[PDB]
Amino acid sequence: VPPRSLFDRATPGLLK
Amino acid sequence: TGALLSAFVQLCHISTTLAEKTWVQLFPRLWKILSDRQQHALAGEISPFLCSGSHQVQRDCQPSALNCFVEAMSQCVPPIPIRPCVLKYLGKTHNLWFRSTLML
Amino acid sequence: LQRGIAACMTCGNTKVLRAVHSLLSRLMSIFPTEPSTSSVASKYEEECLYAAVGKVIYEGLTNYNPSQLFGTLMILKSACSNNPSYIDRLISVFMRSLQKMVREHLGTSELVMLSLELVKTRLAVMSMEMRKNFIQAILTSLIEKSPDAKILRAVVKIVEEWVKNNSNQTPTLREKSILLVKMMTYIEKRFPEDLELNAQFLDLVNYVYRDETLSGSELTAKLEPAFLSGLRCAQPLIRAKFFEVFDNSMKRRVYERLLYVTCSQNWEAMGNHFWIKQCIELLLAVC
């Protein structure tokens, strides 16, 4: 798995 | 102003009522200041969040979170894009019967 | 006196073991029997005669209780006073009585378990053969089927001390995360009223999230329900210390926080909660 973390601030889809 | 907002939030914590209203009355205020570029994406991604899959434990919550969120979203000025199917689903599952009918 | 006090070591309790505890002050000096052979003591061992009984006491307790249980408690506390290490041979036979007494539940056993967890957690030497059974017994009895809250608080304390050290790497991430998730699952379900151990576990997870972040970032994935529960807890200090770390993880921009709460945050783990007040928190703190 990638270096993911549910607590991180990963905010995808700002213009997608 | 920092002393006011902290105590306001600590007060909204204990009271579920009169805090739902704060979100209903503040979210559209935020929408007003968001530019078109931000508002478009936010409205386009809110519907997936209105569904949000397993966010259904609130189905039995008296003040369900989806109720307040969709009320606030509908109380905005430009909120055109919302699917009628999701509206009916929220109305049936959550306590959004008459609001959903009015919107539809 | 070395010839006489040995008689008290034979577990003639009559509430005198508390008086035998007085001899701990003497053992604080050297207690050289473990770090080297037993013959290194100079005319105060006849700690050979005492270590002999401390080792042989396992017989009655393993061959089968409160009497011998407290005897073992006190003798291991006195022997382990200064030198924390001790031979694996006695552990391999003593830790069986732990599980045997644990499964016997169907009052002093709680204190015996407290002392045993205190004494055993100082050093870990097994080659992952029996240590697996140790961690399994912990997570299945002290967390899941613990009737008393004191032993649960004590295991929370020991795992906090485990995650607290930073120098040497006695614990490992796997069993650490296993214990943490089992706690997150059961500690709040079976002990909702005893807010003390709940606050202790929440402080533990808050420390795990705050300190040593550069080292551990995968453990945070499974402990999302714990973080959310600590955020929605009824205690104001815990809520504040959780929000102060929940806010700094994102840019101080209204649009970024809105996108976060709308598409990147999963509120499923909240559980019949009015989580929108946390949205109010996040939207008003950035002002």
What are the tokens at C4?
A: 């006489």
What residue type is C126 in one-letter code? M
Q: How many helices (H) and strands (E) does chain C have?
A: 17, 0
Contact between C202 and C233 (Cβ < 8 Å): yes
Please state, in angstroms and rounded to a whole number, the distance separating the CA atoms of residues C128 and B93: 51
Task: Calculate the alpha carbon distances from C99 to C2, C61, C138, C228 in Å.
Answer: 34, 12, 9, 34
Task: Convert C153-162 to b/e letters by CB count within 10 Å (16 or more is b).
Answer: bbbbbbbbeb
* B96 backbone dihedrals φ, ψ, rounded to 5°: -125, 30
CB contact under 8 A, B20 and C268: no
Please state, in angstroms and rounded to a whole number, the distance separating the CA atoms of residues C18 and C21: 5
What are the tokens at C222?
A: 């499974």
Residues contacting residue A2 through CB under 8 Å, at least 6 positions apart: none
CB contact under 8 A, B46 and C268: no
Please state, in angstroms and rounded to a whole number, the distance separating the CA atoms of residues C238 and C212: 20
Please state, in angstroms and rounded to a whole number, the distance separating the CA atoms of residues C204 and C206: 5
How far does the CA of residue A11 sit from the closest CA of chain C (Å)?
6
**Nearest residue on chain B to A15, judged by CA atoms?**
B41
Question: Sign of dihedral through CA atoms C53, C54, C59, C61?
Answer: positive
What are the tokens at C283?
A: 């939207």
CB contact under 8 A, B45 and A15: no
CB distance from A2 to chain C under 8 Å? no
CB neighbours (10 Å) of residue C257?
21
In the DSSP assignment, the letter for residue C145 is: S
Please state, in angstroms and rounded to a whole number, the distance separating the CA atoms of residues B59 and B66: 9
What are the tokens at A16?
A: 């997608």
Report the first-to-last Cα separation within chain B, whole angstroms. Answer: 40
Please state, in angstroms and rounded to a whole number, the distance separating the CA atoms of residues C27 and C80: 9
Q: Which residue's structure tokens are 């929408």?
A: B31
Contact between C71 and C13 (Cβ < 8 Å): yes
Report the run of H or E that residue C254 belongs to, with start and end: helix C254-259
How far does the CA of residue B47 sit from the closest CA of chain A (Å)?
14
Q: How many CB pairs under 8 A join A and C?
A: 34
**Nearest residue on chain C to A2, judged by CA atoms?**
C218
What are the tokens at C51?
A: 């270590």
DSSP string, B45-102: HHHHHHH-TTTTGGGG-TT-HHHHHHHHHHTSSS-----HHHHHHHHHHTT-HHHHHH
CB distance from C220 to chain A under 8 Å? yes
